[PDB]
Every structure is written in structure tokens, then in C-alpha cells.
Amino acid sequence: SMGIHATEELKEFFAKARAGSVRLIKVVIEDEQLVLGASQEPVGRWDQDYDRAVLPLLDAQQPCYLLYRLDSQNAQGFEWLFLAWSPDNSPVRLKMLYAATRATVKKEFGGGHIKDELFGTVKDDLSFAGYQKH
Ligand SMILES: [Zn+2]
Ligand SMILES: [Zn+2]
Ligand SMILES: [Zn+2]
């Protein structure tokens, strides 16, 4: 369809991530496709990994999405946080592209694996401190 789609490589990576060994997935839009921007393995607990994983990957003038893995599992696997980043300094065109495509990222990943959803426009919003206030 007309909307931005996840590449088959990104979908495959999603499945790999849910098997384990992935703490963070950064999804970005490149050439009208959703693709893998970055990924990181777990180091310690989900709370210990959080800020050092999330904060450095947030650009002051580009939106992105992060899938951040908790240590808990529900009955359909690891639980994830779905973090939407959209700083005001982003070009309006990018803000709307990312806003328009958010639901697609969640749908492709599988909403049933997502424990919670957060949004930020300043890094503090999506920091561990932000998550604890949510
Ligand atoms: Zn299409
Ligand atoms: Zn749960
Ligand atoms: Zn929530």
C-alpha cells in the first residue's frame, strides 16, 4: 500500500530480537521504508542498561522509535517498551512521517509483546527518570 512498510529484514530482526540477546532496537525510516538503525545486547538488568542504551541514540533533530526490552516475560515472550521520539527541532515533514508511521511499527512488531508506550520530545521524557514517572 501507500504507507511506509517494514522491510522483510527488519521483520526478521524483530523475530530474532524476541528470541533473546537484544536489549534495544532502534527503528528509523530510510528511503520510504522502516529499517534497523541500531541494536544492542543486554549487559545487566533492564534498569541498569536503560539510560546508557536509550539516551545516546536520541538525535536532537530527528524522530525515531525504540523498542526497549524489559527482563519480564508474559505468556507470549519478553515484554517491551515502545518509545516514540519526536523532538520539536525536527523538520515538520519528518515529524509527520514518523507520527503517521508509528502504528505500523507497533503492528509489525506485535502489540501483544509491548507492555507500555511512551513519548518524548526532550531526552528527559524518555530517560529512566521519565519511565519511572510514567
Ligand atoms: Zn505498499
Ligand atoms: Zn506483564
Ligand atoms: Zn503507559
UniProtKB/Swiss-Prot annotation:
<protein>
    <recommendedName>
        <fullName>Twinfilin-2</fullName>
    </recommendedName>
</protein>
<comment type="similarity">
    <text>Belongs to the actin-binding proteins ADF family. Twinfilin subfamily.</text>
</comment>
<comment type="function">
    <text>Actin-binding protein involved in motile and morphological processes. Inhibits actin polymerization, likely by sequestering G-actin. By capping the barbed ends of filaments, it also regulates motility. Seems to play an important role in clathrin-mediated endocytosis and distribution of endocytic organelles. May play a role in regulating the mature length of the middle and short rows of stereocilia.</text>
</comment>
<comment type="subunit">
    <text>Interacts with G-actin; ADP-actin form and capping protein (CP). May also be able to interact with TWF1 and phosphoinositides, PI(4,5)P2. When bound to PI(4,5)P2, it is down-regulated. Interacts with MYO7A.</text>
</comment>
<feature type="domain" description="ADF-H 1">
    <location>
        <begin position="3"/>
        <end position="134"/>
    </location>
</feature>
<feature type="modified residue" description="N6-acetyllysine">
    <location>
        <position position="11"/>
    </location>
</feature>
